[PDB]
A paper describes a structure:
We prepared the crystals of the [name]-ceftazidime complex by soaking a crystal of the [name] free-form in mother liquor containing 100 mM ceftazidime for 4 h. Crystal structure of the [name]-ceftazidime complex showed an acyl-enzyme intermediate where the S64 catalytic residue is covalently bound to the C8 atom of ceftazidime, and its β-lactam structure is cleaved. In contrast to the free form, crystal structure of the [name]-ceftazidime complex revealed a drastic structural change of the R2 loop in that the H-10 helix was disrupted and disordered at residues N285–L293. In comparing the crystal structures of the [name] free form and its complex, the C4 carboxyl group on the dihydrothiazine ring of ceftazidime occupied the position of the side chain of Y346 observed in the free form. The side chain of Y346 in the complex in turn was rotated 108° toward the H-10 helix and positioned to clash with the S287 residue, and this appeared to cause the disruption of the H-10 helix structure. We did not observe overall structural changes except for the R2 loop with the RMSD value of 0.68 Å, and the positions of the substituted residues E114, K120, and S211 were almost identical. The residues I284–L293 almost correspond to the disordered residues in the crystal structure of the [name]-ceftazidime complex, suggesting that, in the crystal, the fragile structure was entirely disrupted by the complex formation, without the influence of crystal packing. Our structural studies presented here clearly demonstrate that the ceftazidime molecule is bound to [name], and that this in turn leads to the drastic structural change of [name] to accommodate the ceftazidime binding. The structural change of the R2 loop in [name] leads to further expansion of the substrate binding site for cephalosporins, and this expansion is a major cause for the reduced susceptibility to cefiderocol of the strain. In the [name]-ceftazidime complex, the K120 residue formed a stable salt bridge with the D123 residue.
Author numbering: 2 to 284, 291 to 361
The structure:
């Protein structure tokens, strides 16, 4: 059983050389141990203006934004507004291209739609460009054949998922997920009064923030603090005291297993592997692989490693938890650094907290 000092000594002994080796300017880390968050901060949120990382510092979550997407989508399922078996064209009729018949919300939500591009092109800047973009996309595989990770599929899923509620994605995410969970420092658009807490990302030694883009809120655009992300991991790990019945089940649905791709199972936003597992088995994510459908989706199991990585131009994020142990970690950095380094550091910390 670890004391808070033993936790701090473990986390520092991993993060301190990591930040020097990767030249990370600032990091915020939360460990969930026995269900309780422990907070750690090092370095600068802004090097030139000498602003330290605090527990309020806002980091670009990058693709960890897709976990908020999944939970809001699972919430919509629980409300009865959508079903994953529903066709895409139900919620966007102007998608009359014959290639869209047979594509369901399930596919956009789990990257199995047949091969949408990784990013929405920079050319696309309004509804017309975006509708034209999807209308003229030619699939590479039949729906459900392969998993190909992308922003453009789960990004569209989140925008369509919220149409029954009659609410925008930002508004729905705020009303149905952020506010009920008390995530008061998690933003799609950082308010004026919070700009000063918005850390700068660093790429090649220069400060950068990500630029807006079509479907950015749904795929990569959430900013948040280490305290909120600790609460976000807490709630996804154990929603047993979430009061909203639909949000509680949405969290459960997001950790259901919808597809098997080797040793990994695709949730809604979240990804899972069986626990316990070797570090090397987490350490080709950008490759298209055959997807085996799990139908019905298998309910969540405690003995899993639930995680999501995210990156922007100037930030690297990683969150991971193992529900069987009430154990989890949030890793926020204002520099993008290699994915296997995050996994290895997360594993090293959580392996000593057994
Ligand atoms: C390789 C991908 C595919 S896109 C996806 C996504 C979510 O984090 N990232 C972006 O959309 C993104 N950059 O991705 C990389 C890291 C590939 C990049 O091009 O920098 C981005 C969004 S706004 C911004 N600035 N950058 N994640 C990753 C990852 O594994 O880090």
């Amino acid at each position: 059983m670890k004391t808070e000092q033993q936790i701090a000594d473990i986390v520092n002994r991993t993060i301190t050389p990591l930040m020097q080796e990767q030249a990370i300017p600032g990091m915020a880390v939360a460990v969930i141990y026995q269900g309780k968050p422990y907070y750690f901060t090092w370095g600068k949120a802004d090097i030139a203006n000498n602003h330290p990382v605090t527990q309020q510092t806002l980091f670009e979550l990058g693709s960890v934004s897709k976990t908020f997407n999944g939970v809001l989508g699972g919430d919509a399922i629980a409300r009865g507004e959508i079903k994953l078996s529903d066709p895409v064209t139900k919620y966007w009729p102007e998608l009359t291209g014959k290639q869209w018949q047979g594509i369901r919300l399930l596919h956009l939500a789990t990257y199995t739609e047949g091969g949408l591009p990784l990013k929405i092109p920079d050319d696309v800047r309004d509804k017309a460009a975006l509708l034209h973009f999807y209308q003229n996309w030619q699939p590479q595989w039949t729906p459900g054949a392969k998993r190909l990770y992308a922003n453009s599929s789960i990004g569209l899923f989140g925008a369509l998922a919220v149409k029954p509620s009659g609410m925008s994605y930002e508004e729905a995410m705020t009303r149905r997920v952020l506010q009920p969970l008390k995530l008061a420092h998690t933003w799609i658009t950082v308010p004026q009064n919070e700009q000063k807490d918005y850390a700068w990302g660093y790429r090649e030694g220069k400060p950068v923030h990500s630029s807006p883009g079509q479907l950015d809120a749904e795929a990569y655009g959430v900013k948040s603090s280490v305290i909120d992300m600790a609460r976000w991991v807490q709630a996804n790990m154990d929603a047993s005291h979430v009061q909203e019945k639909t949000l509680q089940q949405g969290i459960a649905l997001a950790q259901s297993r919808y597809w098997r791709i080797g040793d990994m199972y695709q949730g809604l936003g979240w990804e899972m592997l069986n626990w316990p597992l070797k570090a090397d088995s987490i350490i080709v994510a950008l490759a298209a692989l055959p997807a085996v459908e799990v139908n019905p989706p298998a309910p969540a199991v405690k003995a899993s490693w639930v995680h999501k990585t995210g990156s922007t131009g100037g930030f690297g994020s990683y969150v991971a938890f193992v529900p069987e142990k009430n154990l989890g970690i949030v890793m926020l950095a204002n520099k993008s650094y290699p994915y296997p380094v995050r996994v290895e550091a997360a594993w090293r910390i959580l392996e000593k907290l057994q």
